[PDB]
Every structure is written in C-alpha cells, then in structure tokens.
C-alpha cells in the first residue's frame, strides 16, 4: 500500500534519483492540506451509518426489483451482505482519502469485486447507483460550512469524489 508520500518515493527509487525540488514542493502543498483532509475523513466517518443506511433506503425505493421476493437483496442474509458491501466501500474510500492514494481502495476493495458480482449475479450497475448515493451524501457532509474553520475544501472534495467515482466504475 502507498500513501501520498510513499508513492513518490517508490517512483523515485525505481529511477535511482533524489526527489526534485518540484516534487518536494508538491508534497509540501499536500501537507498544507492535511487538516482539511483529516476533517473530511472525520466527517465522513462520523456519519458512516447514516450515509450507508440512507443510500440503501434510497436505492431500494428507486429499484424495488432488488427487494421483491427473489430479488438480489431479498432475504436477511443477502440484504445484510448488501449493506455490508456498501459499508466496506465507504470504509476504503475514507482510507484512500486519509492516505491520499487510491492504492488501498484498489487493492483491498475494488480489485476482484466486479468478478465477484458477475459470478454471483449481483447487479453491479445497482451497486454503482448505491455508491453514487453515498457519494452525494458524503460530499454534502464534507462541505457543511457549519461547526468548522471556514476555508476552501474544493480540492479535497474533488479527490474524494474521484475515489467514489472510481468505486462506482469498478463495479458497473
């Protein structure tokens, strides 16, 4: 797994070179965003259960076929697995947000997920819909101006949306 810093170090070592001034400046710029990053992780985490449950409620309302008898999310066992998957994805999205690198999301969560859903008949498109609902909910939470030092989080918000979009694409 890589974080924002080790990603650059790994590339540099493969070329046998010191980090250039620009690279050290880019990382310094990343450090200057650290507090916003931490706040975004904290805010998403603090609302984890609501994000997952609301997204799931909305998905089933839009897509009633998922919960009709015989639907993919029917029976407590499958419904539980469905809720579990949404939480797993949200969890690794926060890891990636926290580390500043998507590798943890790709390696632990997304590499092999499409193959799993295809093999089991899980409607990946519907998972992507659910992920998008968690995305919209999460970004609203991260952007709430109230109760926090005011500042510009647009850059961090874009990075997080990238992770959600990456998750959604991987299963669709």
């Amino acid at each position: 797994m890589f974080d924002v810093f080790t990603r650059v170090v790994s590339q540099a070592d493969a070329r046998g070179e010191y980090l250039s001034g620009s690279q050290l400046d880019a990382l310094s710029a990343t450090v200057a965003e650290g507090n916003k990053r931490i706040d975004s992780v904290n805010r998403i985490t603090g609302n984890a259960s609501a994000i997952v449950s609301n997204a799931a409620r909305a998905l089933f309302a839009e897509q009633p076929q998922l919960i009709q008898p015989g639907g993919n999310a029917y029976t407590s066992r499958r419904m539980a697995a469905c809720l579990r998957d949404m939480e797993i994805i949200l969890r690794y999205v926060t890891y990636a947000t926290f580390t500043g690198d998507a590798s943890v999301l790709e390696d632990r969560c997304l590499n092999g997920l499409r193959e799993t859903y295809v093999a089991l008949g899980v409607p990946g498109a519907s998972v992507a819909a659910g992920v998008q609902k968690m995305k919209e909910a999460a970004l609203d939470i991260v952007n709430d101006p109230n109760g926090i030092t005011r500042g510009d989080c647009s850059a961090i918000v874009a990075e997080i949306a990238g992770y959600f979009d990456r998750a959604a694409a991987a299963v669709a």
Partner: protein, 289 residues
C-alpha cells in the same frame, strides 16, 4: 494417492515428506525443523529475510512457552503475514491464502467465503485467523503439535472440487503464493460463486502449457451443448485449452490463450494447427458424452 502424475503435478516432493511433529521433550534441532516448516508453509514459500524473522515467537516456540499451533497462530497474526497476504489483497484472495497456509487445502464452497468475510468484517483479521486455527478441521488434521501441510490426498470429509482447486492455488515447488501468474487476483472468486471447476494445469517445467489462463470474458464453456450437430459427422467432442499462441501475430492473433471444442475426427488437424500457431496444449478434456 497420487503416483503416476505426482511429479508433473508438483506433488512428488510432498509425497516424499512426513508431517513435522514437535514431540514432548523435543530437541533444539526439532524446534528448528518446526520453525523452518512453519515459515515455508504459512508464508507460502516466500523467502524470509533475517530482518523479517519473528525472533520472539521463535524463542517462545523453542522454549515450549507456545506449542506448534500457537506458533502458527502467532505467525499468521504477525505484521509479516499481513503485509504479505492481507494489506494488498481482495478479501476473497486473503481467504484463499489462509485456507492454503493454515489448512493446507482450497476452499470448497461459497459458504466458506461468506463465513470468513463476515467474520473479518465484524471482528477483524485476528478473529478470522483464529477461526481457521481453532477449527475442527485444523484440530483433526494437525492438532496442537504438527505443522500444517498440503492435503493433496483424499480424506474423509473432502469434496472433489477441493482437489481441482488446490492446483489453482499451488503452482509448483519452486514457487510462492506471491510469485504466481495471477498475481494478486483471487483464483477462486468465480469458481466459488458459480460452483464450477477448471481443468487442472500443472506447474511449469513439467507442463508445456502451464501458463494457460482464461480471460475475463469470451471463454469457451466446458461442455458441448448441442453435441456433434454443429460439427456434422463427428463421434465425440473434446475441449482443448491452448496457450502461447503467437505465430500469425496481431491482429490475426488477439488472445494468446484459447479453448476450443473440436471433434474426435479433427484432433489430428487440431494438433497440427496448434503447433503451427506456436501454441502449447494445456489440457484436453472430453466435452460430449
């Protein structure tokens, strides 16, 4: 047992080995043999650097402060095991590996994935590891004092699908779980989900077609639905798996791996054509009745 095909399947060295048991009042050489066996088994024959050794756990094993099983447990829960097998893997991959390392067999069913995925998700990696080691299956095969080993041979409680799947996880003696063609990808996600099996392709060196691996999509099904009708007059059909196709070159050649269903009466032509493609036969399996 496995006799005629043992060498080509990479099983012969395990046929030639006995379980590594730590007897009461063991000698230091006994302890060293256990430690070596546990590192080879539980870490999937990766090279282990001196800086990566679990010196404290080794001391406790040598002292009899922990039994073999507790030493296995410690290795399985170590940052070394997790770095090798957890942090970079899809959890289904992790479960495959745990089964191979700690039980010496491949998962039988999707139920095992459900159980261990939920256990990990609800209680964490350590809890999941304990479930393998404290399992009835672990107790019956290895008990407190025997290092886990590959269970190639048929035992009570087995299922046939286990035998074929071991050769999806075990790729030969001079090989490690982290140095296999499929790299980090789950080997069994699709097999488990569909409850299907794949033709066995033995290790490199002793099998020319060792590299055959199917693609994500556009594969040939195992059985010849429709029988010989599409082929005209044909007595019986076979599914041939072919790898290393290169000779015509792109775009005439797209995928170097291909499985074809061909009639008995064209096998001579098929082998001739395969050779001229440069390809290597990975497996041949009857496809009709």
């Amino acid at each position: 047992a496995i006799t005629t095909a043992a060498s080509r399947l990479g099983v012969a060295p395990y046929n030639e080995s006995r379980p590594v048991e730590l007897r009461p009042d063991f000698s230091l050489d006994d302890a060293k043999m256990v430690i070596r066996a546990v590192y080879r088994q539980v870490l999937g024959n990766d090279y282990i650097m001196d800086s990566e050794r679990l010196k404290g756990a080794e001391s406790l094993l040598t002292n009899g402060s922990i039994s073999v099983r507790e030493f296995v447990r410690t290795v399985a829960k170590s940052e070394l095991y997790k770095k090798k097998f957890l942090y970079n893997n899809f959890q289904t991959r992790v479960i495959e590996l745990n089964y191979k390392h700690l039980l010496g067999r491949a998962p039988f069913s999707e139920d095992e994935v459900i159980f261990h995925l939920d256990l990990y998700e609800n209680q964490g990696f350590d809890a999941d590891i304990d479930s393998y080691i404290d399992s009835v299956e672990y107790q019956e095969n290895f008990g407190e004092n025997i290092v886990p080993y590959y269970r190639f041979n048929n035992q009570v409680g087995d299922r046939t699908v286990g035998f074929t799947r071991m050769f999806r996880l075990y790729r030969g003696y001079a090989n490690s779980d982290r140095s296999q063609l499929e790299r980090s990808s789950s080997r069994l996600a699709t097999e488990l989900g569909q409850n299907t099996v794949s033709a066995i392709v033995g290790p490199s060196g002793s099998n020319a077609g060792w590299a055959y691996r199917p693609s994500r999509a556009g594969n040939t099904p195992a059985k010849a639905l429709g029988g010989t009708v599409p082929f005209g007059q044909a007595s019986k059909l076979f599914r041939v798996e072919i790898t290393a196709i290169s000779a015509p070159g792109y775009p005439k050649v797209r995928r170097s791996n291909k499985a074809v269903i061909v009639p008995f009466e064209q096998l001579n032509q098929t082998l001739q054509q395969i050779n001229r493609l440069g390809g290597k036969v990975a497996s041949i399996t009857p496809a009709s009745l």
